[PDB]
Amino acid sequence: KLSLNRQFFDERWSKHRVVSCLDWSSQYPELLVASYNNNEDAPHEPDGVALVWNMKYKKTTPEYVFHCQSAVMSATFAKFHPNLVVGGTYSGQIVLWDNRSNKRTPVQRTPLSAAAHTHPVYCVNVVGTQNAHNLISISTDGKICSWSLDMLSHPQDSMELVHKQSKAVAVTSMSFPVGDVNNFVVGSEEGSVYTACRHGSKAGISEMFEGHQGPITGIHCHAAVGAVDFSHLFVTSSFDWTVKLWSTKNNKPLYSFEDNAGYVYDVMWSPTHPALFACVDGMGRLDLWNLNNDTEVPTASISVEGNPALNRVRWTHSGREIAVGDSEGQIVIYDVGEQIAVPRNDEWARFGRTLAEI
Amino acid sequence: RPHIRGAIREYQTQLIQRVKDDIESLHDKFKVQYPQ
């Protein structure tokens, strides 16, 4: 069972565009961000036009319109900035929009210097809390750059990302684990997914684990079972149609869950109910599932209207619903409803450990 | 020290609006000219 709620779409700004990454309100509740892509059929329009919506207000208009010059390859909210919107681009500059200024252009654009990114940033993110935060931009070039949300003309802390060999690490949708232990996992271009540190001389790339050959599209981490498990588990996504569960100590671990007749594009599993991961396809199917109940099948899955290549999906934080980003500019909103967080749900840990023994 | 420097933005903005208003008063009073 999947509770298909309302949808968000506006032809005024989703006119034959590609829905890029998403994010829910990391500060507010259920008011999400939608990064888009350029539509070369409309060259007069801005390339990257981000948009937001408000599920808690129950309306249809894209509440805010924001648009830099280039195509926004990534976007999300800002940590403890209830007026700001951070953003990655295709060119390499990192933008910064504001809502209260009513300026449909970002007010603080990262330069295009070598010290900054001159390659698209697929994953730019805030990290800790009030005093524990920063802004880490990681372009596909292979550089990380810490930035304050105040100073943006120069990266606060910045270094590259290379393996033991001096070859580049074409990152794609990295993710910090729970707690910001600075050991963020990095979805590389294809295979060689890495764990990478930030503080110490050992910062950067820790080790390579390869369990799939198709080019990576996403990664995610999660939290506690209700203070039962460590939950450092992180699942990935790739173009080989398979999704592998990983560990911080394995190299070719846990069963690579494969969805056939579909090009996997993203995974993100809500820490609420320790295992409820949702993958997507290049056909219009949301085949999400829990590993405790099922084993290798989508639990309460659904397909999507028409055949949209579902680009990105995000669980509604601290609760349950699903944001859906397609290859076509349209946002769909589903919900589990009946797939409530099971209490004392350690069945999954016993399950994954029993599978891990073979 | 960034450790220290993180938790003061609220107070900073309070002081900025103070600075703001006073420089605005300077725009006002200097916009009136010396002969008058």
mmCIF file of C-alpha atoms in Angstrom, chain A residues 80-81 130-131 150, chain B residues 2-3 6-7 9:
data_model
loop_
_atom_site.group_PDB
_atom_site.id
_atom_site.type_symbol
_atom_site.label_atom_id
_atom_site.label_comp_id
_atom_site.label_asym_id
_atom_site.label_seq_id
_atom_site.Cartn_x
_atom_site.Cartn_y
_atom_site.Cartn_z
ATOM 1 C CA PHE A 80 19.621 27.018 10.801
ATOM 2 C CA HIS A 81 19.013 29.558 8.054
ATOM 3 C CA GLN A 130 24.508 25.576 15.195
ATOM 4 C CA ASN A 131 28.238 25.749 15.865
ATOM 5 C CA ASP A 150 28.957 34.035 5.606
ATOM 6 C CA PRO B 2 35.933 29.294 14.961
ATOM 7 C CA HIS B 3 34.880 27.273 17.967
ATOM 8 C CA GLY B 6 30.178 30.245 15.795
ATOM 9 C CA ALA B 7 27.586 31.140 18.413
ATOM 10 C CA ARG B 9 25.485 35.649 14.868
#
